[PDB]
């Protein structure tokens, strides 16, 4: 599977997601952005079955954007994540289920807290300081259990991810072509374009 990593610090949520897209025997692409923006202060990363992955994410983005216009308001991360969970939980007993796992990273402008939600294809949502889907946790969780502090700056966050990615590039057998990293805070969503040699 593709790498889907997330960490919530003092004042922001950071998502890191692998760049590779492999189809069988060849790496078709090494710059893929495994993410949609749902609303100005909510970002979603995603990994799983080839077509369903982007189809699901754009379907969620479209609904949130509709809600935003209808109500001229931005749903709270918790509210967006519940919607997303309900959608996956519907999908699991349907004819052909979306096999998509997601991280939702949002900055709640009404609470002034960052929030990170992990939801798998079954619709199993949990709220966490850090998370991943697939094999990613197996390599990174012991590092995060060790170094993680709730009062970390965004700068400290990125350093801890750098470590996590290093471990992944040493022990995980697949070349995932690195990660695109994104930060979600009170000012919205920006991409760190200097992670390659940060």
């Amino acid at each position: 599977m593709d790498i889907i990593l997330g960490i919530r610090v003092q004042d922001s949520v950071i998502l890191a997601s692998s760049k590779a897209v492999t189809r069988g025997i060849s790496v078709l692409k090494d710059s893929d952005d495994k993410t949609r923006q749902l609303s100005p202060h909510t970002l979603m990363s995603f990994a799983g079955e080839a077509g369903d992955t982007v189809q699901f994410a754009e379907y969620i983005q479209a609904n949130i954007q509709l809600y935003s216009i209808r109500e001229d308001y931005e749903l709270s991360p918790q509210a967006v994540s519940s919607f997303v969970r309900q959608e996956l939980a519907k999908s699991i007993r349907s004819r052909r289920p979306y096999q998509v796992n997601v991280l939702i990273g949002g900055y709640d402008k009404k609470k002034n807290k960052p929030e990170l939600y992990q939801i798998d294809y079954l619709g199993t949502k949990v709220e966490l300081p850090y998370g991943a889907h697939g094999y990613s946790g197996f390599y990174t969780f012991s590092l995060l259990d060790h170094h993680y502090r709730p009062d970390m700056t965004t700068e400290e966050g990125l350093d801890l991810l750098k470590l996590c990615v290093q471990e992944l590039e040493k022990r995980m057998p697949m070349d995932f072509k690195g990660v695109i990293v994104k930060i979600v805070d009170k000012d919205g969503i920006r991409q760190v374009d200097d992670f390659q040699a940060q």
């Binding site: 918790q78 509210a79 309900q86």
Partner: protein, 244 residues
């Protein structure tokens, strides 16, 4: 065939009004008056039970004030039975919203939904519209205390104070005169009663002919509380405001 007997409930007049809506509003105008007043720290709903009897049970009754949510309530003017159909769907809508988003439904979203349902009976289906007007009182953490009104047309509007049912002309004039933006719930209660008292078609305004409710922010808490006044509690509040 059947075409002969079709009243055509959903057509325009040559003037461009909807007969059935107009006639349903005409029905509502004869219904016991209901009043909503919005304060900085609360909302009041007051409604007048039209014609009663000594033998009518008042302890096991609530015919004009209905709870939609923990945070939303309505007062009804028109056909009670029609109103229950609508109230029930509105209670369902609120819980679907809660299930979907883990947040109570913002008041406008619930009022719009109900209004949409009414508008449909206006445009398709050849059924008569619902003979019902609502006053909505509710709270959410976006616009705080809100007060809305909807009628058979499916139009809704927001209000600082409003009446539906009988004598609304008279009641609105009285509300416009004595209502001020800095009012507190306790004054609002009083205004509501006064206004009903001057607009009744009865001799006097006794406790048994009233329903009363408030949505306050329980002063020892930090969160919102809805109180449908018990027959005793109406009797009490009617003496405090000096109408014994």
């Amino acid at each position: 065939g059947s075409r002969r007997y079709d009243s055509r409930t959903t057509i325009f007049s040559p003037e461009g009004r909807l007969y059935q809506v107009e006639y349903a509003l005409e029905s509502i105008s004869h219904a016991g008056t209901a009043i909503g007043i919005m304060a900085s720290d609360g909302i009041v709903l007051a409604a007048e039970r039209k014609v009663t009897s000594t033998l009518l049970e008042q302890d096991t009754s609530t015919e004009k004030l209905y709870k939609l949510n923990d945070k939303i309530a309505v007062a009804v003017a028109g056909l009670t039975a029609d109103a229950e159909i609508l109230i029930n769907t509105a209670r369902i809508h609120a819980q679907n919203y809660l299930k979907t988003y883990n947040e109570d439904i913002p008041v406008e979203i619930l009022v719009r939904r109900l209004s949409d349902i009414k508008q449909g009976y206006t445009q398709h289906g050849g059924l008569r519209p619902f003979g019902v007007s609502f006053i909505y009182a509710g709270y959410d953490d976006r616009y705080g205390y809100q007060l809305y009104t909807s009628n058979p047309s499916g139009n809704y509007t927001g209000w600082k104070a409003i009446s539906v049912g009988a004598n609304t002309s008279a009641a609105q004039t009285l509300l416009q005169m004595d209502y001020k933006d800095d009012m507190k719930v306790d004054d609002a209660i009083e205004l509501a009663l006064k206004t009903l008292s001057k607009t009744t078609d009865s001799s006097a305004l006794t406790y048994d002919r009233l329903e009363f409710a408030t949505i306050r922010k329980g002063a020892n808490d930090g969160e919102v509380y809805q109180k449908i006044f018990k027959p005793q509690e109406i009797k009490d509040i009617l003496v405090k405001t000096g109408i014994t």
